[PDB]
Design a protein around this nucleic acid. Structure first.
Lengths: 119, 31, 97, 181
RNA sequence: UCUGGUUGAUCCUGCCAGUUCAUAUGCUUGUCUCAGCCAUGCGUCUAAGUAUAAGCAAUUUAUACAGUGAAACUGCGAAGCUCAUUAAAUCAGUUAUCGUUUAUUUGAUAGUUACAUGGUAUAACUGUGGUAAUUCUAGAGCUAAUACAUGCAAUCUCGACCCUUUGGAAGAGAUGUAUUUAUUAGGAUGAUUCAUAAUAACUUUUCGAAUCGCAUGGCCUUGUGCUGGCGAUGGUUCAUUCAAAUUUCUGCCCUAUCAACUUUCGAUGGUAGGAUAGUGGCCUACCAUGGUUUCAACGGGUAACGGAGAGGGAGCCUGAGAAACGGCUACCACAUCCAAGGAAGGCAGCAGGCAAUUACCCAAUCCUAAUUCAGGGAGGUAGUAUAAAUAACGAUACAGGGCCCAUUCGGGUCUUGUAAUUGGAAUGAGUACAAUGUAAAUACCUUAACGAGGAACAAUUGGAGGGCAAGUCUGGUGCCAG
């Protein structure tokens, strides 16, 4: 909930550590009818494969749960993702400042608290 | 500055032993 | 040709078998039959065909590869004693009730 | 039952479909880029209008707003990666300077024509929809595919295609058999 | 909201004409992809409780039976729908049960004729019959239990002799459990009349293996003599666990145009009694007149879906747990069959329309049972707005017109037209061999062979113009006009 996508975009440039990119042809959803997977789709998918490998069996998707996880996840795509890069976060309104803001109790409140941080 | 300020917040939002690692280890000994 | 590679080979004394992830490299062809895969697995691990239980084969998009799961019991009797009834029937080790 | 689902439209009809300038514009655009109907342009115009609405929102915000630098640099990175926005013009006023024919130029059909694999945009389209064009190791049959720079580099004939090294098509081997017979 | 007229030319006010995830209706594609009425139909079996099936099979596995096993007697468990509506009285959190019951799981726990008693017993079963007739039935004759009843030469202390100094040992003594009452003593908690022990009695005085399967060891006193291994099913009490029932405090609507409410067949409290599984006006006999409230009692409204019954009320029965979607009695109605003598039902249902809810399974997640294996309409499986194609690339022949602007006259521009012939390639819908997929199967994915010139493998919808006859009509100033 605190995570908002583009801050990690800056981190990736500012991390100075590589990002484990995948192959160009491996990323089409289905023959071009579904665009390239967004970066998020490649993490949530690998959670499944990493989650499948240990349990030694697949996960079937319930007929009900199928009706809020497949389409909209790929209707956001055709509405948002163009060439596999998400554009939905841009139109959406979020309080970006609060997620970054030092709202934790360890925050500057008096002159001494900020004076400590200089030390 | 703001990028870091986000980083400590996640650290705040987010004897030393992991149950899963102990489960992976027996799987590895099983391996 | 076709290649079979096994990873995460977890040997299970309590069910007395070996479970693993089987990956199949099949250029220029449909896919491999489970009888066929069990054949090659059982020559490789030096076990009877009744003791090898493979399942769950999915071809990744674009073809040419598959990933699934495989079991190789320490004995054939153990294979009957532990395998699901249907997984025994699909090999003919058990008859449909 | 269980929760219903959100879905959205990728295009919107223009304010007035009937300006002669407008019609001549779709005529030029469909002719140059071989578009099937006006729904593709309506889609691209909708998408570009959304990007511009975001960009003007950011131009409105004062420089050094967290929101502004955030949202705009993210826009610039995405528009660069799709290849529309060149490396030397990474600033939001030039985001405000795009034009739809850039997005049509990024359509896989256009590269299949442009790289020399096809002699025409329509030839490119029939090759793509017929599974003769592969983006690296993967066969793609959608002309509306948006090609990235790294994906632009790797456009080729597919291994399974008769033009990529597979066996001659049904017509060729059929005629060869009849000639032999 | 805009656009053009109304002037010789403008401004203003008027007039005229053109300028939808709303509803119906029409054509096409849906070859791929994708998403109040109706007489309308309709339980349970392991090696382990009982076999004399006149059941089955085997033969040495049975001279008491011994495998399997119908029936019957025992044991265990049976605990979705449809209507109404209710403001912290539902529900959520939390406290207490030293105020309670609790199948099952788990840990402990009972030295106080017998080489095994009776029918005080019958089912299944054999046989005789009545009835229009039922999960309707009477007579006669059998036979069993983990069903029903009955029921059976030990140990521990004080210990002289201080004999021997571990030690033996005279003598004295002592010795279930359950209920109720009375009495005495009184490790645990903050706290107890709590726990436990003892005495005197009481009780329609409880219980303290007459059970089963597999194995046949150790001894000798050769008798089938003594002594025995692993389990199952039973049983008293306590604790634990699964739960249940009350109970402490807290918890976002408007409210006084809702100010008193209660004792209205208990309202507040005490004593005693009745009942509960137990506390308690919960109820009963007497006694006091109390209890909430302007710090909002009580009453009213509500987007408080934001608790009730199985034809209708009354009553009973089982079990650890239900006032049972089970059964029984009477009453009130509905309605069926009949030989009109009686019998039986809860369908007064369910599902539909103003019409196919089916077929395949306990595998997967789980569970009930004499339980590995049986079952579960719990559950699972199947049935019935979104991206493509209808085509792409050449060669040749034959002809000079093709297009744009302009009310007007005309002006502007150049590689064109085919309603001509012809060539080799590509592949999709279809026709489909397989494997995979799966409880099995469908579907998905992958994949042999075939598959285009009218590529007849023959998508539509709407609009604007023509032109043609020995053709037809109507009006005219011929050969015209409509």
């Amino acid at each position: 909930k605190s995570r908002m996508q583009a801050m990690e975009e800056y981190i990736r440039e500012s991390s100075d550590q590589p990002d484990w990119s995948a192959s160009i042809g491996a990323d089409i959803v289905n023959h071009g009818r579904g665009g390239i997977k967004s970066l998020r789709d490649t993490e949530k998918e690998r959670r499944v494969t990493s989650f499948e490998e240990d349990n030694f069996t697949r996960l079937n998707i319930t007929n009900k749960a199928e009706k809020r996880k497949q389409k909209q996840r790929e209707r956001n795509a055709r509405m948002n993702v163009i060439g596999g890069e998400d554009f939905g976060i841009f139109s959406s309104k979020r309080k970006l400042e609060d997620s970054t803001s030092r709202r934790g109790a360890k925050k500057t409140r008096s002159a001494w608290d900020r004076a400590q941080r200089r030390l | 500055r703001l990028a870091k300020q986000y980083l400590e917040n996640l650290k705040s939002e987010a004897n030393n032993f992991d149950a899963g690692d102990l489960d992976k280890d027996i799987i590895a000994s099983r391996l | 040709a076709v290649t079979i590679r096994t990873r995460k080979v977890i040997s299970n004394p309590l069910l007395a078998r070996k479970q693993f992830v089987v990956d199949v490299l099949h250029p220029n062809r449909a896919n491999v039959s489970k009888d066929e895969l069990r054949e090659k697995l059982a020559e490789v691990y030096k076990a009877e065909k009744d003791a090898v239980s493979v399942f769950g084969f999915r071809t990744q998009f674009g073809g040419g590869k598959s990933v699934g799961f495989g079991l190789v019991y320490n004995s054939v009797a153990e294979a009957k004693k532990f395998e699901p009834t249907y997984r025994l029937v699909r090999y003919g080790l058990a008859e449909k009730v | 039952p269980r929760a219903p689902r959100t879905y959205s439209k990728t295009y919107s009809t223009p304010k007035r479909p009937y300006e002669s300038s407008r019609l001549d514009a779709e005529l030029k655009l469909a002719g140059e880029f071989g578009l099937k109907n006006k729904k593709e342009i309506y889609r691209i115009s909708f998408q570009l209008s959304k990007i511009r609405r975001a960009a003007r929102d950011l131009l409105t915000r004062d420089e050094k707003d967290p929101k502004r630098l955030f949202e705009g640099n993210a826009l610039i990175r995405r528009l660069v990666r799709v290849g529309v926005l060149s490396e030397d013009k990474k600033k939001l006023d030039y985001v405000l300077a795009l034009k739809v024919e850039d997005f049509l130029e990024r359509r896989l059909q256009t590269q299949v024509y442009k790289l020399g694999l096809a002699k025409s945009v329509h030839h490119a389209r029939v090759l793509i929809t017929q599974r003769h064009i592969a983006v690296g190791k993967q066969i793609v049959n959608i002309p509306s595919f948006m090609v990235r720079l790294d994906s632009e580099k790797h456009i080729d004939f597919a291994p399974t295609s008769p033009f990529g090294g597979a066996r001659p098509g049904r017509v060729a081997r059929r005629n060869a058999a009849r000639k032999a017979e």
